[PDB]
């Protein structure tokens, strides 16, 4: 139904506010904020949000505390100031999906429409994207297991509208822009193998742990498509792709003649001015 979402950095900055207004208690749970956004277009667009006092129990996961009156009052006053945005979904800032989150989700599946869930991180030490849109849908399973609410990842992008760019860019003065050429290309080309390395190494090690030490339907079926597509690249023999390397290598030779020739043209004013300025300022110096 929905292919992608758009989450503005304002709400994650309000998750910085989630970690601001704590007051140092010793709890630091997955504090839930009431996500607001635009379900109106087929794409989901988050503008802003707020948060609600939410408590679980230490031992019991299934005890969870929300408010309808706080939702209708904060959403009521927010709709009074801006009715162009409505309720859409929610989020917890914990790294882990609890068992209770189907029931916590179910309250906003009832009163709000089909609500989206966002897992983000309490400490932004993850190099990966912190935000993951998990659609709250029940899907029919091939094994015959009974149908339950299933959180499939909807792909996400983090974009800012107009002024959030200006304010963020004014606050940083540290980030550099697009800046094609040597640096912004070559830095992605520096850390890029580390970026698939920590992804893959972060996945296949504990994945391999859940191979031998795991049960309880880990989606054993998607391992077959998984390993299948992984064996759709069986270390290509390159024999047809040799001429492709002649092609990129011949384009490389074009970059050779352009670099050599054009830099050699830049040598002109250099190797004129080096003589004609120095010897004339010298010969009229005395």
């Amino acid at each position: 139904a929905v292919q992608k979402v758009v989450v503005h950095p304002l709400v994650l900055l309000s998750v910085v506010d989630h970690f601001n207004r704590i007051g140092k208690v010793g709890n630091q749970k997955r504090v839930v904020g009431v996500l607001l956004g635009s379900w109106q277009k087929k794409v989901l667009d988050v503008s802003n949000s707020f948060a609600v006092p939410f408590d679980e129990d230490d031992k019991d996961d299934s005890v969870w505390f929300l408010d309808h009156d706080y939702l209708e009052n904060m959403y009521g006053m927010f709709k009074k100031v801006n009715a162009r945005e409505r309720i859409v979904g929610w989020y917890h800032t914990g790294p882990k999906l609890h068992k209770n989150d189907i029931a916590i989700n179910e309250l906003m599946k009832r009163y709000c429409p089909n609500s989206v869930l966002v897992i983000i991180d309490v400490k932004p030490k993850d190099l990966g994207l912190p935000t993951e849109a998990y659609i709250s849908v029940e899907e029919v399973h091939d094994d015959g297991t009974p149908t339950s609410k299933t959180f499939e990842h909807v792909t996400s992008e983090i974009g800012a509208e107009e002024a959030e760019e200006v304010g963020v860019e004014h606050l940083l003065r540290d980030i550099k822009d697009t800046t094609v050429g040597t640096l912004s290309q070559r830095i992605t080309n520096q850390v890029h193998g580390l970026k698939g390395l920590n992804s893959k190494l972060l996945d296949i090690r504990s994945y391999l742990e859940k191979v031998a030490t795991g049960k309880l339907p880990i989606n054993h079926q998607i391992i077959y498509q998984l390993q299948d597509v992984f064996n759709l690249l069986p270390d290509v023999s390159l024999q047809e792709f040799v001429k492709a390397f002649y092609l990129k290598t011949n384009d490389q030779m074009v970059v050779v003649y352009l670099a050599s020739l054009i830099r050699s043209v830049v040598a002109l004013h250099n190797l004129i001015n080096n003589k004609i300025a120095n010897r004339d300022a010298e010969k009229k110096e005395g």
């Binding site: 003649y257 020739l261 043209v265 003589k275």
Partner: protein, 55 residues
């Protein structure tokens, strides 16, 4: 009509074989070679300025 290049082909007398092929990327070596020839007068006229200014 191969000699007037109305289409792609080349014949044979021993074997009687026809082969049909084409060369689409014509505009690479053109702009490359003309960039070389136009840079020739840059370097040579530079050497006329420098051969002027030294000796």
């Amino acid at each position: 009509m191969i000699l007037d290049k109305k289409f792609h082909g080349i014949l044979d007398q021993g074997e009687g074989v026809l082969i049909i092929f084409d060369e689409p990327p014509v505009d690479k070596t053109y702009e490359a070679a003309l960039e070389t020839i136009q840079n020739m007068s840059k370097v040579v006229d530079s050497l006329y300025n420098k051969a002027k200014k030294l000796t």
